[PDB]
C-alpha cells in the first residue's frame, strides 16, 4: 500500500528577550515517531515508538545536529518575517514548515512537500512539480524570488525524490 | 530522517 | 571556537599539473564547507560547497574537494591546472542554520607557469 | 553577486570620516564587511542578519556600522587613521556560509 514521512517544524519566539522554541515531530503514516524539542533540559532526537529502538547512537547524534542547525536556521527566519511584515520585537509569533514524501503503492513518489506557514497563514509552497513555488502574498514573493535565483527547488526535490523514499522505506521495515 | 534548510526566508 | 587552516600562503605549478590545496579546519559541529576562489582585482566567489552525504563534492572546470570527517579536512584538487586559474584559494567552515559562525582559512596564492 | 560598494577608491587624511556603501539588490539576510591585507588574508570587521542589526566581527576596533535597511549596510571610519589603509570587501548571503562579494573599495589613510 501507500505511505508517507513528514516532518513538522514549528519555531515560536517568546516574550521579551525571550529565544524561539523550537520543535520538531516526525510522522510516518501519520503517526509520530521522533520529535525534538528545544525547551527540554537535554534536547536531542528522541524516539517516540519501540521500533526506532534499533537505530544507533550515530543515527541519533546526526539527526539531532539537524535540529541543531535548523533552530538557528527558524531564529533567522523569525527576526526576517518581522522585517518583511514591519513589527515588533517583543512579540510572539510562529513559523511552521512541512515537508516529506507521499509513496504509491508501486513504491515511487506520490508526491513532495516543502511549504510554510506564518501565524497561522499560508505562506510559501513548493508545486507538485517539485520545481516552482506558490508564494501565498508580498512578503512570499521576495522569499519566493530568492528561492528560485538560489536555484532552492533542486536542493529540495533532491531529497524528496531520493532520501526521503529510501528513508521512509527503511523505517517500515520495522514491524 | 530530516533535511537541513538551507536559504533562508 | 572556530577556524580554518591552510599550510601554504603562496603555491606555484607548472601549467597542466595535478593540484591539491590543503584544508584542515577545528570546529565541535557538523559544518558546511566551501571553497571560494579571487581572481585577480576580483572578490571572492563560491567555487565549491559540501552540504552532507557524499564527501566528494564537484565543481565547474575540473575542480572538487573531499570532506573527511576522520580528518577534519576538505582538501581541494583538480587533474590539471591552467594559467586561467592563478588566484587567491580560500577555505571556508560554517555552522548550519546560521550566517554569525563563519570562517575563512589565510586563503592561498596560486600561481600557474603557463 | 548584485552587490555594489561606493566608493570604489577613496584617500583621506588622518583623522578623516570616512563611510563605505555596500547595497545588495537582492535582499539577502547577512551581510559583511571584510578588509584584505597581505599576510593577514580576510578579516571580518561587522557582520548583521538583518535590518537594524549590528554584530561585532574579529577586529571592529576603528569601525562602525549599519543596516539601516535590508539593502543596505554602511561602513563608517570615524577617526581614520593609516593603519586602516586596505581593501574592503563587502559580502551579502542568502544561506548559511554561502557568501558573494562586492568588487572591493580600495583606501588609503595618509598621516
Known amino acids: 500500500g501507500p505511505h508517507s514521512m513528514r516532518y513538522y517544524e514549528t519555531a515560536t519566539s517568546r516574550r521579551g528577550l525571550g529565544e524561539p522554541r523550537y520543535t520538531s515531530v516526525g510522522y510516518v503514516d501519520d503517526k509520530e515517531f521522533v520529535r525534538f524539542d528545544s525547551d527540554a533540559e537535554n534536547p536531542r532526537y528522541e524516539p517516540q515508538v519501540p521500533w526506532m529502538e534499533q537505530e544507533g547512537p550515530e543515527y541519533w547524534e546526526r539527526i539531532t545536529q539537524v535540529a541543531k542547525g535548523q533552530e538557528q536556521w527558524f531564529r533567522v527566519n523569525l527576526r526576517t518575517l518581522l522585517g518583511y511584515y514591519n513589527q515588533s520585537a517583543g512579540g510572539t509569533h510562529t513559523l511552521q514548515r512541512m515537508y516529506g514524501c507521499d509513496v504509491g503503492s508501486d513504491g515511487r513518489l506520490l508526491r513532495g512537500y516543502e511549504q510554510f506557514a506564518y501565524d497561522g497563514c499560508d505562506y510559501i509552497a513548493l508545486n507538485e512539480d517539485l520545481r516552482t513555488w506558490t508564494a501565498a502574498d508580498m512578503a512570499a514573493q521576495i522569499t519566493r524570488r530568492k528561492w528560485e535565483q538560489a536555484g532552492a527547488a533542486e536542493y529540495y526535490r533532491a531529497y524528496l525524490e531520493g532520501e526521503c523514499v529510501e528513508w521512509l522505506h527503511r523505517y517500515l521495515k520495522n514491524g | 530522517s530530516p533535511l537541513d534548510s538551507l536559504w533562508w526566508i | 571556537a572556530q577556524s580554518v587552516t591552510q599550510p601554504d600562503a603562496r603555491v606555484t605549478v607548472s601549467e597542466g599539473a595535478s593540484l591539491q590545496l590543503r584544508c584542515k579546519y577545528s570546529?565541535?559541529?557538523?559544518?558546511?564547507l566551501f571553497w571560494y576562489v579571487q581572481y585577480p582585482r576580483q572578490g571572492l566567489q563560491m567555487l565549491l560547497k559540501?552540504?552532507?552525504?557524499?564527501?566528494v563534492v564537484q565543481g565547474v572546470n575540473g575542480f572538487e574537494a573531499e570532506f573527511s570527517k576522520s580528518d577534519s579536512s576538505f582538501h581541494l584538487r583538480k587533474a590539471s591546472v591552467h594559467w586561467s586559474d592563478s588566484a587567491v584559494y580560500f577555505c571556508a567552515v560554517s555552522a548550519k542554520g546560521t550566517g554569525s559562525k563563519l570562517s575563512f582559512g589565510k586563503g592561498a596564492k596560486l600561481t600557474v607557469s603557463p | 553577486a548584485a552587490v555594489t560598494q561606493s566608493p570604489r577608491n577613496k584617500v583621506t587624511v588622518t583623522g578623516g570620516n570616512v563611510t563605505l556603501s555596500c547595497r545588495q539588490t537582492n535582499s539577502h539576510n547577512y551581510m559583511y564587511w571584510y578588509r584584505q591585507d597581505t599576510g593577514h588574508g580576510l578579516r571580518l570587521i561587522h557582520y548583521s542578519y538583518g535590518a537594524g542589526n549590528l554584530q561585532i566581527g574579529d577586529v571592529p576596533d576603528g569601525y562602525k556600522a549599519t543596516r539601516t535597511t535590508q539593502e543596505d549596510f554602511f561602513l563608517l571610519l570615524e577617526l581614520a587613521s593609516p593603519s586602516q589603509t586596505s581593501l574592503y570587501f563587502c559580502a551579502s548571503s542568502d544561506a548559511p556560509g554561502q557568501l558573494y562579494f562586492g568588487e572591493g573599495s580600495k583606501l588609503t589613510v595618509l598621516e
Open positions: 570546529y565541535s559541529a557538523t559544518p558546511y
Open positions: 559540501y552540504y552532507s552525504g557524499d564527501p
